[PDB]
Amino acid sequence: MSYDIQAWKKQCEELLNLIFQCEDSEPFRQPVDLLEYPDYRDIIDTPMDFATVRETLEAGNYESPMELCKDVRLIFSNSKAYTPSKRSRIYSMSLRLSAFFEEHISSVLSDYKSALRFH
Ligand SMILES: CC(=O)Nc1ccc(Cl)cc1C
């Protein structure tokens, strides 16, 4: 529906489903195991992963698509900080998936901002 302030919840649910099914999401699907990777929290202030984002959305704990968008960007910016080398296949995966996410989210954001002006 045009001007729907609730539309972003279904749009983000479906975009996350597409991300999970994409091979480039593999490293970012679940929280980093800290006892497996002991220096992760030395580098990363605020861990984030797509399972946390999906669970937060399904629980209704995002107020806006901007909030969900901030958490997804944190996944990609954490990857660039932990895996900064352009040689890394993981660097390449987060680059491709970030570009994919940013392409889909832009219209979710602008539709939401239109809907909120209307409301
Ligand atoms: C989300 C994240 O950066 N995870 C990760 C990536 C590459 C390597 Cl080699 C190890 C880990 C734990």
Side-chain angles (χ1 to χ4, degrees), residues 27-28 32 37 40 78-79 82-83 90:
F28 312 111
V32 172
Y37 299 100
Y40 190 74
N78 285 349
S79 182
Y82 194 65
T83 309
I90 301 307

Coordinates of all heavy atoms in Angstrom, one line a residue, residues 27-28 32 37 40 78-79 82-83 90, ligand 1:
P27 N 29.8 -15.5 6.3 CA 30.6 -15.2 7.5 C 29.8 -14.3 8.5 O 30.3 -14.2 9.6 CB 31.8 -14.4 6.9 CG 31.8 -14.8 5.4 CD 30.4 -15.0 5.0
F28 N 28.7 -13.7 8.1 CA 28.0 -12.6 8.8 C 26.7 -13.1 9.4 O 26.0 -12.2 9.9 CB 27.8 -11.4 7.9 CG 29.1 -11.1 7.1 CD1 29.2 -11.3 5.8 CD2 30.2 -10.6 7.8 CE1 30.4 -11.0 5.1 CE2 31.4 -10.4 7.2 CZ 31.5 -10.6 5.8
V32 N 30.1 -13.8 15.9 CA 31.5 -14.3 15.9 C 31.7 -15.0 17.3 O 31.2 -14.5 18.3 CB 32.5 -13.1 15.8 CG1 33.9 -13.6 16.0 CG2 32.3 -12.5 14.4
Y37 N 37.7 -17.0 18.4 CA 38.4 -15.8 17.8 C 38.7 -14.7 18.8 O 38.0 -13.7 18.9 CB 37.6 -15.2 16.6 CG 37.4 -16.2 15.5 CD1 36.2 -16.8 15.4 CD2 38.4 -16.5 14.6 CE1 36.0 -17.8 14.4 CE2 38.2 -17.4 13.6 CZ 37.0 -18.1 13.5 OH 36.8 -19.0 12.5
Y40 N 38.8 -10.7 18.6 CA 37.7 -10.1 17.9 C 37.3 -8.8 18.6 O 37.3 -7.7 18.0 CB 36.5 -11.0 17.6 CG 35.6 -10.4 16.6 CD1 35.9 -10.2 15.3 CD2 34.4 -9.9 17.1 CE1 35.0 -9.5 14.4 CE2 33.5 -9.2 16.2 CZ 33.8 -9.0 14.9 OH 33.0 -8.4 14.1
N78 N 32.2 -3.3 10.7 CA 32.9 -4.3 11.6 C 33.8 -5.1 10.7 O 35.0 -5.3 11.0 CB 32.0 -5.1 12.5 CG 31.5 -4.3 13.6 OD1 31.8 -3.2 13.9 ND2 30.5 -4.9 14.3
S79 N 33.3 -5.7 9.6 CA 34.1 -6.5 8.7 C 35.3 -5.8 8.1 O 36.4 -6.3 8.1 CB 33.3 -7.1 7.6 OG 34.1 -7.9 6.8
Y82 N 37.9 -5.5 11.0 CA 38.5 -6.8 11.4 C 39.3 -7.4 10.2 O 40.3 -8.0 10.5 CB 37.5 -7.8 12.0 CG 38.2 -8.9 12.7 CD1 38.9 -8.7 13.9 CD2 38.1 -10.2 12.2 CE1 39.5 -9.7 14.5 CE2 38.7 -11.3 12.9 CZ 39.5 -11.0 14.0 OH 40.1 -12.0 14.6
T83 N 38.7 -7.3 9.0 CA 39.3 -7.9 7.8 C 39.5 -6.8 6.8 O 38.8 -6.6 5.8 CB 38.3 -8.9 7.2 OG1 37.9 -9.9 8.2 CG2 38.9 -9.7 6.0
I90 N 37.0 -12.7 2.3 CA 35.9 -12.2 3.2 C 35.7 -10.7 3.0 O 34.5 -10.3 2.9 CB 36.3 -12.5 4.7 CG1 36.5 -14.0 5.0 CG2 35.2 -11.9 5.6 CD1 35.4 -14.8 4.6
Ligands
LIG1 C1 32.3 -11.4 11.2 C2 33.8 -11.6 11.0 O1 34.6 -10.7 10.8 N1 34.3 -12.9 11.1 C3 35.5 -13.4 10.7 C4 36.0 -13.1 9.4 C5 37.2 -13.7 9.0 C6 37.9 -14.5 9.8 CL1 39.4 -15.2 9.2 C7 37.4 -14.8 11.1 C8 36.2 -14.3 11.5 C9 35.7 -14.6 12.9

